[PDB]
Structure formats: structure tokens, C-alpha cells
């Protein structure tokens, strides 16, 4: 029997938490786990721009015939503009090629498969901490994962000196992974000056930069959030960007992402992209149309784009209001620890500083669900659940 | 430069054909390449049942939050009933688990990664000829692919004696891949008696059967086309089914498929399935909702399901009428080679028996596009293009 001696896999630290939450029969349960956006009423809504684009598609789509391996061309063009900005030299020099992928995760795996099967790359460097699924994606393609220092847990800040010292061990030809903005799980991003230091260091050391860009627009703004990436794009001959539209379009389950390859010149990137397409063909063949068609419809229509940008701004500002409310409410409810570092962190997530034992108590005794690392989803907080959430946190301190 | 030593990959023998066809500016060009269904007017339509389901989803969807790793529960249940039959003991005994995947290709890749990482499987046996992407998918997980004999190119039939003999060296614990119906590319399927003989041999030799089911309903009907799989399922402890809804729902670009694991008992299949979910999480994370939501809506609603089944019948019957018209028109246009074997083949495709040289002449000289193996898509034939198509074939014979 071929399956008889298979060992059971452990649950995913994020998606397995979601299974527990669903089964929990207590009415007061609060979900601060998976990184989705909740509105002020505690639902996970479909954006109006998205509903409008879907209505257009329903009434005008005449075929579902296969897309090309790399997806909808306009989707690729609009993605490169978002990442690199209109009039970028990378675009005018035809140094970049984009494949539409099933989510940001699919873009990460396509990049990993492409690298493992066509280059001499063996190692990927990931921040400590990072998104837990980074290691699994890269290991599954056959690549070793190494960790570089990032978070100073005593000061709740970016330990830039520790980051640079640990990365000096990364060799030429190694891949180093950066979060473009809204670092998952810490919410601590480099400043523009720090980005520029890392870019120049990356050139001098011969690293291959890989950017995971899942939160463009949730820190400061669409253009501002790409400053770090663009400082790298100005200096490097080669880079890879794995981007996601799951969160900034609320299109999580339609699986909309992109893998963008950059090389020294047009001939080289086309040669490389041909092997990226072969790796896609042997994975899922070609990408799902519905979600990407929605994104392409919104980004190419000035009226729909204006609505979407306002909806994204509203999401970003609601999270910022909850960060403030969370800190103020913790003080009212009797916390004596200072939680003001929460205000300095960007995006959906903050490292709360709670221990695994406290996170477990919160779930079992109070029905508050966070990830075991102490990562909390601030976008899961609402004016209505803030008081019970904070009473529960104070009770486990 | 990391990308400098990269060797270019050739174009896909099937999907690259569409790129050439698109670039051909000559009027009257005819596309008999990729395996999509064309209607009598040469279009690739969206089914009415699909449009109705998409309207229901637009009106009633309130969130796009992530699906579970394995997708929509109802989709998995309806898939199992389609494959194994309502009231199957496999279902009643809870011996089967199904993951929603991005197309049939995604189901094959998920199975490949699962096998490579969690079992002692080292070798997959596929028919000669087969779909060209089979070897690429299993090789992407590091599995050796061997070929078994299948097609009698002299008699245009299944060479069952050579099939049996050429599988003599397939060992216990090897995977043997079978097309469930409508063999791609030959259109030649085993008879029920041949399936039963293969089922008995597979058990005695200890093979792990893997069925690729991309065309259920295109040979004789939904239940009839599953007879071979059900003969295998009655006798085996373990098997894998990779199925696609791309073609029988006309949902190609929404990437709707399923990977079904079957084990000896519920405890075993649940343990194995946890590792399949881990392999999905490290690839594309979770599957695209839109296409699978359409299928689940249609299969779970008596009225929509009845519309869809009639639409599938209409597709199947138009292809059968084009098979007959193709043979008759070849005779009318002066072919001396007997093409009557075309009538005995099932599904969208027939091996025409044309050489690579003749297929090239058809493209370059006449604007008629087939796959270089001589596979022609009969579903691309219409009353309007049949006569020029046949005149071109006669010209290269
Ligand atoms: C959400 C996320 C991803 C995965 O994005 P998907 O589009 O859901 O696959 C990858 N990396 C980070 C840092 C993320 O936050
Ligand atoms: C079409 C086909 C596939 C792939 O199906 P998709 O759903 O497009 O990924 C796999 N195997 C065979 C034999 C096919 O004909």
C-alpha cells in the first residue's frame, strides 16, 4: 500500500487557525488571524469597483477560451506600471516581462521553480521573522532557506545593524527576499534611506533581489509604497517581483497575482521568460481569468480606477484608526505596558509581544484568535469588538 | 549575471500553435490545433448554464475571502458523485478526498508533488502517444516517466497486445496513467472488457493507477464514460483521479479541476490528504473560486444541471456529425486514402496519420493549423470550412 505509511502533516499556522475559528461555537469569538480586511461591521466585503467590473464581464464576455501561458497582456502592462511607475526606463527598455499567476503565492512558487530548474541558485535569504509560508514555498522547489536578522523585539524596531551584519554571509548568486512594504508579520519597513543603502549593498555583493509585494497601497500610498522597489530597480541588472492583488483589491479567493522578471536587456529577459513559461505550463498550464480580468478592467478605466483608489484609501485609513483606538483602549482597560509601538507599524499586522502561552489562553478562554507568534490582524478590529478584545488581552498580561 | 547561462525553451507544441495562428495574416486560415470546442459558426461560446450561474453568483456573493486549501466542499462532493456514481461504496465508506485545483493540469501537478515528497513512487508510465504535457508535469516533480505502447498506427486501433507486453516491467508501486475516455490524441479508448482486463492486471501487479479525466461526457455520456474508472475503483485499495471541467463546461480559462485521492479506509485517506493540502499551500495556496463556484451551482441545481447536460449532448453530437462529414468530404474531394477509421474515434481529436512534413505544408501553404503529431481537432471543423480544409489535405497526400 503506497499511502499506508504517510505521516500526517501539521496544520498551517495561519489557515489552520481559520479552521479552528469556524468550528468554535461561542458567539463572542473574534478573528485576528488570517490577513483579510474586515470593514467596520465585521464583514469581509466585495469592493464596489469589483462588483461593477464583474457586472461588465458578465454582460460582455463571449468566450472562456484559454488565456496564454502568461495571462492577459493588459494585466501585465498595468502591473509593470504600478510597480515601476509610468515612463520607467525598465519598461521603455523592454527589460521586464510579467506572467499573471494564481495569487502572490503562485508567483513565488513560479519564481522558485524557474530559479531551481534553470540557474545555479541554491539559497534564498528570508527575514527573521517572515510569512511562515515563505520557507515552505522555497523548500518545495528544492531551495535552501537562510534567515537574516530584522526585528529588535526589545525596542520593537528594525535592527538595521544586525540586518547588514547577518546578510554579509550571503554570497554572489544568492537570492535575498525583501517585503516591498507592510512587512508580514512585524509591520516595520525600512526607510527610503535604508532601502537605498540595501540596494547599493545588493549591487556590490551580487545578490539577486526578490520582492514579495502583497500590500502595495496599505502603508502610505500606491506610489510611495513602491519607493523601495524602485530604488532597487534603478541599480540592478536583474530582479524578480512576486506581487499580489488579493488584499488591495479584496480578491483573495480569485487568485490574482503576477511574477515579474527583469534582466539586463530585452534579449536576455525574453530568453529567461521562455523558461518561466515552461515552468508555468508544467504547473497549472495557464492562469485563471476572472480575477485578473476584474483588475485589468478597473485599472484601464479611469472612472473605475478612481473608485478603487478611494476604496483602498478608506481601507488603509480604517486600519490606522484601529491602531490608535487599540492603543488608547488598552490603557483604559488597565494595561500598564506601553503599546505605543503599535502606532509606528504599517499595514494589517503588528507583533503584539504576547507569548505563545498568552495567545493560547486568549483563544481557549476568551475566543480571541491570533497567530501563535503573537501576530494580530488590526484590520480584524472594529469599534464593536475593541472593548472585549482589550479586556481579554489585559486579563492575560 | 544570474540569467546569462539560461537556455531558451522551445514553444509549447500545442499552446504555441495559437501564437502562430494569431500572427498569420492570410485570409481563410483554419485552426484545428488546441483542444477547445467550436460551435457551427467557428466561435468558442460560453454555455447558457454557465451564464445563468454567473448571474446568480454576481447577485448573491457577499465576500471573496479565501477558500480553504481544498476548495469548495460541495464541489468536491459533486465531483465524487460524477466520477464514482451516486451511492458508490467508495463514498459511503469515506475512502475518497477531493481537492479543488486550478484545472486538470493543476490536479496532475498536485498529485505529482504529493507523490514525490510523501511516497516511494519514482516512476510514472504514460501511453505513447499521450498529451505532451504529461511528461513535463511529472518531470517537474523529479519523477521518471516511461512510455507504454498504445496505438496501432496500421489498423488505427488499440494495440492491446503491445500495451500488455510493454507494461510487463512496470513494478509494484509504480504509477500507471490512464486516460478515462477520449484518449488524447488518438481518440481510441479501451472497451469495457479491456478496462476490466487492465483492472485485474493492475491489482495483480500492484500498480498505483492515476486517471486523467479531461473529457467526461464527450465519448458516449457522463455515466458511460466513467465505466472504466469504476471497474478500477471496484477492485483497488488506492487510486488517484485528476479531472478537468475545462472542456465539458467550456470553462477553460477559469481553471476548474479536481484531484481525488482514494485509500483503503477513511483514516488512511485523511492522513494522506493532509500532505496533499500541504503541497497545495506551498504551490498556489488555495484555488480560484469563480469557475468552481459555477460548476458547483450547476451540479447542485436540478434545472441548471438539466440545461448543462443537454448542452453537453449538443456538443458531443456536433463533433460526431463533423467526423462523418469530414470522411465524406475527403472522398468527394478525391482522397484515395481510406479515412473511415475517423468515425470509430471518440472525442475532439483524431490522429490523422499525416506526417510532420505534411502538417508543415498544410500550415505554410494552406493556412491550416494542426499539431505536428498529426492530431486534428474535429471540433474546429464547420460546414463552412470543411470543403477548403479537405481540399488542402488532399493536396498534401
Ligand atoms: C498574502 C501574502 C502572500 C500571498 O498572497 P496570495 O495572493 O494570497 O497568494 C504572500 N506574501 C505575503 C507577505 C503575504 O502577506
Ligand atoms: C485538457 C487536458 C488536460 C488539462 O486540462 P486543463 O483543465 O486545461 O488544465 C489534461 N489532460 C488531458 C488529456 C487533456 O485533454
Write structural notes for this entry.
Chains A, B: L-aspartate binds at residues 35, 131, 184, 375. Chains A, B: This is Aspartate aminotransferase. Chains A, B: The modification N6-(pyridoxal phosphate)lysine is found at residue 247. 2 copies of one chain form a homodimer. The first copy, chain A, is α/β, with parallel strands linked by helices and 397 residues long. Chain A has a domain at 55-302: Aspartate Aminotransferase, domain 2. Chain A is built from 15 helices and 13 strands. The first copy, chain A, has helices spanning 15-23, 48-60, 73-84, 89-92, 103-118, 133-140, 160-167, 192-205, 222-225, 227-233, 266-281, 289-299, 302-332, 356-366, 386-396, and strands spanning 30-31, 96-101, 123-128, 144-149, 151-152, 157-158, 175-179, 208-213, 239-244, 257-262, 349-351, 368-369, 375-377. In chain A, the strands form 4 sheets. Chain A has a 7-stranded mixed sheet, with helices on both faces. Chain A has a two-stranded parallel ribbon with strand order 1-12. In chain A, helix 6 (133-140) links the parallel strand 3 (123-128) and strand 4. In chain A, helix 2 packs antiparallel against helix 13 (302-332), helix 5 packs across helix 11 (266-281) and helix 13 (302-332) crosses helix 15 (386-396). Chain A starts with 14 loop residues before the first helix and ends with a helix. The interface between A and B is large, with 82 and 85 residues. One pyridoxal-5'-phosphate binds at residues 35, 103-105, 131, 179, 184, 212, 214, 244, 246, 257 of chain A.
Amino acid at each position: 500500500g503506497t499511502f499506508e505509511n504517510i505521516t500526517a502533516a501539521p496544520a498551517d499556522p495561519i489557515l489552520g487557525l481559520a479552521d479552528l475559528f469556524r468550528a468554535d461555537e461561542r458567539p463572542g469569538k473574534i478573528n485576528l488571524g488570517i490577513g483579510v480586511y474586515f470593514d467596520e461591521t465585521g464583514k469581509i466585503p466585495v469592493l464596489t469597483s469589483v462588483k461593477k467590473a464583474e457586472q461588465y464581464l458578465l454582460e460582455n464576455e463571449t468566450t472562456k477560451t484559454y488565456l496564454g501561458i502568461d495571462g492577459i497582456p493588459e494585466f501585465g502592462r498595468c502591473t509593470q506600471e504600478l510597480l515601476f511607475g509610468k515612463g520607467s526606463a525598465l519598461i521603455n527598455d523592454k527589460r521586464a516581462r510579467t506572467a499573471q499567476t494564481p495569487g502572490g503565492t503562485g508567483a513565488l512558487r513560479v519564481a522558485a521553480d524557474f530559479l531551481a530548474k534553470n540557474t545555479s541558485v541554491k539559497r534564498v535569504w528570508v527575514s527573521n521573522p517572515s510569512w511562515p509560508n515563505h520557507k515552505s514555498v522555497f523548500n518545495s522547489a528544492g531551495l535552501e532557506v537562510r534567515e537574516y536578522a530584522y526585528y529588535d523585539a526589545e525596542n520593537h524596531t528594525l535592527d538595521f545593524d544586525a540586518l547588514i551584519n547577518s546578510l554579509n554571509e550571503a554570497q554572489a548568486g544568492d537570492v535575498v527576499l525583501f517585503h516591498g512594504c507592510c512587512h508580514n508579520p512585524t509591520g516595520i519597513d525600512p526607510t527610503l534611506e535604508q532601502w537605498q543603502t540595501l540596494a547599493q549593498l545588493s549591487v556590490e555583493k551580487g545578490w539577486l533581489p526578490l520582492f514579495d509585494f502583497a500590500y502595495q497601497g496599505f502603508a502610505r500610498g500606491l506610489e510611495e509604497d513602491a519607493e523601495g522597489l524602485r530604488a532597487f530597480a534603478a541599480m540592478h541588472k536583474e530582479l524578480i517581483v512576486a506581487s499580489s492583488y488579493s488584499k488591495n483589491f479584496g480578491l483573495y479567493n480569485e487568485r490574482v497575482g503576477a511574477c515579474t522578471l527583469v534582466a539586463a536587456d530585452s534579449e536576455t529577459v525574453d530568453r529567461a521568460f521562455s523558461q518561466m513559461k515552461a515552468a508555468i505550463r508544467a504547473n497549472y498550464s495557464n492562469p485563471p481569468a476572472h480575477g485578473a480580468s476584474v483588475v485589468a478592467t478597473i485599472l484601464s478605466n479611469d472612472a473605475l480606477r478612481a473608485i478603487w483608489e478611494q476604496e483602498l484609501t478608506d481601507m488603509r485609513q480604517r486600519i490606522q484608526r484601529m491602531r490608535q483606538l487599540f492603543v488608547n483602549t488598552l490603557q483604559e482597560k488597565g494595561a500598564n505596558r506601553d503599546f505605543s509601538f503599535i502606532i509606528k507599524q504599517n499595514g494589517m499586522f503588528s507583533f503584539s509581544g504576547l507569548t505563545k502561552e498568552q495567545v493560547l489562553r486568549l483563544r481557549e478562554e476568551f475566543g480571541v484568535y491570533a497567530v501563535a507568534s503573537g501576530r494580530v490582524n488590526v484590520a480584524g478590529m472594529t469599534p464593536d469588538n475593541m472593548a472585549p478584545l482589550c479586556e481579554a488581552i489585559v486579563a492575560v498580561l
